[PDB]
């Protein structure tokens, strides 16, 4: 409305000065704009220069537009409506400016406005844009489509929200009118728009699906890459949610996608390749592939080679390899006749790129085809071992990974034939001069450590020699993997790590990196998780190290809780904290408490850990509760004297976290209640027992959750209970003989004495591999008691019948 000459000359002057090649003039223009941007009339001038000053050249008009855009995304709340509306009007009025740079700038402006200040503060953006599609001038329709496309991209919840009153029941049938359109750009926009609303199963589209699918087929023949790409990705998404609709055309579709997977445009080929990934998740995959699988496997295998440019994330190679992995899991051994001739031509090829693809294939199919591959492994594994010292780094690294994919088989064979040389050469490769090899080797060794477990004990010194040595060699990316390897080693070899030499060489560099990291460095996550395992493993010895670690961890929990409260108080000024610092800190405290046990009392005596835990147990985030209940169980065992005052408060929460939807929260709560039981509690039993019985009869997690529930129910055995013995026995008969099993069986003996039942499982379960004498006498006293109280015992399998004469017949 009111641009005056002095103002215009001054702002144009500032834009010219901002375009100076001189670096100092730029920095002071920066502070000058810094000040000016907070005055709305300045924004009025900026938009005026963008849209009205035809006189000025394009980079000036565009720079004005972009500065304005930055202001509209750090200061838009404080914009009054008169200026906002002047910008809005001028944008929609200039959306099709004949300069591409101006057009693009206006576009960023529109989309950034819609973004920062939500789509309803602009009630009429979409309607005008939509009507602007029908306009004559090409640039106008192109610009409007571009804007809509961006809006649909990031503002996708336009249908599920319904804030602007069904903002898609108009647009979608309008996009589908433009599939037919003469210009490739507009077709592309139309499809890219619609595509945003497929996986959501958006009503407006779903009730137009036939028109959609038909127009897509009509488009299949299009040679403009962006259209092919978008059709391809349309079909891929459609395949996930409306399978029914495309069954009748699947043969022709598979033919099309298989053609496009071989497309010369990398992007088309990649979008096509997604088809195999998502098709492999549908149960009709085999039936649909019967006519095409023989061609499909070699195309994927061939696409798994590194690209020419890659020889220097998601790409054709990775997609193809993932597709092969899933197909291997679908077809299992039926795939091997398709894949073995390719492997024979690839694994020994003289061109390293081809060999590399072969090793990749060999790894990819491992999970699905493991059984079928066993016959060939006595030849392939030694060969892979040789490849570990291939002179091409990318061969070494992929070999590392594939071997790790066959670690189980390697471990199950005699150690000297495969395991020993593999571990030796993996260790060598950990100290490779190539960083990709280094991390591949460390990761693969971690996987092997995990599978081998105790089988590593004899090589412990050489392993530690290498892992420690890696500290001085490794950069940042790779220290993370190194910590994971140390952690898994400690978990694998347990207490065997507790030797003075090992502690002295391992701990100092761990503390060294501990001292470098600040409480805000995410690189704490692997180190602390490593320390937790080391602490649990080093049981006796860590003592000289616990103090700073305990304090720092507790402190991290404290400051996390603080930041969370502060953010809950003022979200617009204080960042929500990353709760992983808290989860990891709890997890290390759990490990410390398990390792040191009772010897952590002195540290807990000086601590508010229980008061922090009280808030952790009530956290919204499941992993925080799971960690806090774990720490609760460990401290219950280690130093109950500090916990007892809190039990009356803690128990109703444990009672409210016996929800099997969260397996590990429910589990850790249950375990906690078992440990606390042993230290105690009649009034708390009713709030927990019914749920535990529900959990033990539930047809899910027939493993660790049920055993702990059983143990806990067993522990709650020292009460007047009133079945559940069927799954209890079923669950507990399969666990190793330890203290927990003892406690639970004492409970079942006391409980049977009070309400004797007519479903012997107990007897089958009673077959203890060497129970302590008092527990045995309890058993044979109850058994003998029943015998004093057959055709039924005829049904005992021989091992049972025989065992129950050695101890109690």
């Amino acid at each position: 409305w009111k641009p005056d000459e002095q103002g215009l000359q001054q702002i144009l002057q500032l834009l010219k000065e901002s375009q100076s090649p001189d670096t100092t003039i730029q920095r002071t223009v920066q502070q000058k704009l810094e000040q000016l941007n907070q005055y709305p009339d300045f924004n009025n001038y900026l938009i005026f220069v963008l849209t009205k000053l035809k006189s000025e050249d394009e980079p000036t008009r565009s720079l004005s537009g972009l500065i304005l855009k930055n202001n509209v995304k750090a200061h838009f709340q404080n914009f009054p409506n008169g200026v906002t509306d002047f910008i809005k009007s001028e944008c929609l009025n200039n959306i099709g400016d004949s300069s591409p740079l101006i057009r693009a700038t206006v576009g960023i402006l529109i989309t950034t406005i819609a973004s920062k200040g939500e789509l309803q503060n602009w009630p009429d953006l979409l309607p005008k844009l939509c009507s602007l599609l029908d306009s004559e001038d090409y640039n106008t329709c192109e610009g409007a489509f571009g804007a809509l496309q961006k809006i649909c991209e990031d503002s996708a919840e336009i249908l599920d929200s319904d804030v602007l009153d069904r903002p898609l029941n108009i647009m979608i049938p309008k996009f589908l009118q433009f599939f037919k359109h003469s210009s490739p750009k507009i077709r592309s926009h139309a499809v890219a728009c619609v595509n945003q609303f497929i996986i959501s199963r958006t009503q407006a589209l779903m009730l137009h699906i036939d028109s959609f699918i038909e127009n897509l087929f009509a488009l299949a023949g299009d040679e403009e890459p962006e259209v092919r790409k978008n059709v391809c990705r349309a079909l891929v998404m459609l395949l996930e949610v409306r399978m029914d609709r495309l069954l009748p055309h699947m043969h022709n579709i598979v033919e099309y996608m298989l053609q496009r997977t071989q497309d010369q445009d990398e992007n088309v080929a990649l979008e096509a390749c997604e088809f195999w990934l998502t098709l492999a998740e549908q149960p009709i995959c085999k039936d649909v592939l019967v006519r095409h699988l023989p061609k499909l496997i070699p195309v994927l295998v061939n696409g798994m080679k590194y690209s020419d440019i890659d020889i220097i994330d998601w790409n054709l190679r990775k997609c193809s390899a993932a597709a092969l992995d899933v197909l291997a899991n679908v077809y299992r051994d039926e795939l091997l006749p398709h894949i073995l001739p390719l492997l024979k031509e690839l694994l020994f090829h003289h061109e390293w790129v081809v060999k590399e693809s072969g090793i990749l294939v060999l790894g990819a199919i491992a999970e699905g085809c493991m059984q079928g591959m066993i016959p060939y492994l006595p030849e392939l594994i030694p060969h892979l071992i040789q490849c570990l010292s291939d002179k091409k780094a990318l061969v070494r690294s992929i070999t590392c990974w594939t071997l790790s994919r066959y670690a189980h088989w390697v471990v199950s064979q005699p150690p000297d034939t495969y395991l020993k040389p593999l571990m030796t050469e993996l260790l060598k490769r950990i100290l490779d001069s190539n960083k990709r090899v280094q991390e591949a080797a460390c990761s693969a060794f971690a996987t092997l450590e995990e599978e081998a477990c105790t089988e590593l004990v004899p090589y412990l010194a050489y392993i530690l020699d290498t892992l420690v040595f890696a500290f001085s060699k490794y950069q940042h990316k790779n220290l993370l993997i190194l910590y994971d390897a140390i952690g898994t080693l400690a978990d694998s070899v347990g207490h065997h790590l507790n030797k003075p030499e090992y502690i002295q060489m391992l701990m100092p560099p761990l503390i060294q990196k501990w001292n470098m990291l600040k409480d805000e460095d995410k690189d704490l996550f692997p180190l602390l998780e490593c320390l937790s395992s080391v602490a649990t493993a080093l049981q006796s010895g860590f003592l000289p190290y616990c103090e700073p670690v305990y304090q720092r961890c507790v402190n991290l929990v404290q400051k996390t809780l603080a930041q969370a409260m502060l953010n809950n108080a003022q979200p617009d000024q204080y960042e929500a904290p990353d709760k992983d610092f808290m989860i990891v800190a709890l997890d290390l405290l759990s490990g410390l408490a398990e390792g040191l046990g009772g010897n952590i009392e002195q540290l807990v005596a000086r601590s508010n850990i229980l008061t922090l835990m009280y808030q952790c147990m009530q956290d919204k985030m499941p992993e925080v509760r799971q960690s806090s209940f774990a720490l609760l169980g460990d401290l219950t065992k280690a130093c109950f004297q500090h916990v007892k005052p809190c039990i009356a408060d803690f128990m109703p929460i444990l009672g409210t976290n016996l929800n099997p939807e969260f397996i590990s929260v429910c589990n850790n709560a249950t375990w906690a209640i078992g440990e606390i039981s042993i230290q105690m509690m009649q009034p708390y039993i009713p709030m927990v027992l019914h749920q535990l019985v529900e959990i033990i009869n539930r047809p899910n997690t027939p493993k660790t959750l049920l055993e702990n529930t059983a143990i806990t129910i067993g522990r709650l055995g020292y009460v007047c209970p009133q079945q559940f013995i069927r799954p209890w026995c079923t669950s507990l008969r399969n666990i190793r003989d330890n203290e927990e099993k003892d406690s639970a069986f004492r409970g079942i003996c006391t409980m049977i004495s009070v309400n004797p039942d007519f479903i012997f499982f107990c007897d089958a379960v009673a077959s203890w591999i060497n129970p302590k004498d008092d527990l045995r006498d309890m058993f044979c006293k109850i058994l003998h008691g029943f015998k004093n109280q057959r055709r039924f015992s005829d049904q005992f399998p021989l091992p049972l019948k025989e065992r129950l004469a050695a101890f109690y017949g």
Binding site: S443, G487, D491, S533, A630, W671, K741
Partner: peptide
């Protein structure tokens, strides 16, 4: 019998993978 922790899963997530 005992607590469930996520350490191992977190390490597998961080582990090097070709795809």
């Amino acid at each position: 019998p005992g607590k469930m922790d996520s350490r191992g899963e977190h390490r597998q997530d961080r582990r090097e993978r070709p795809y």
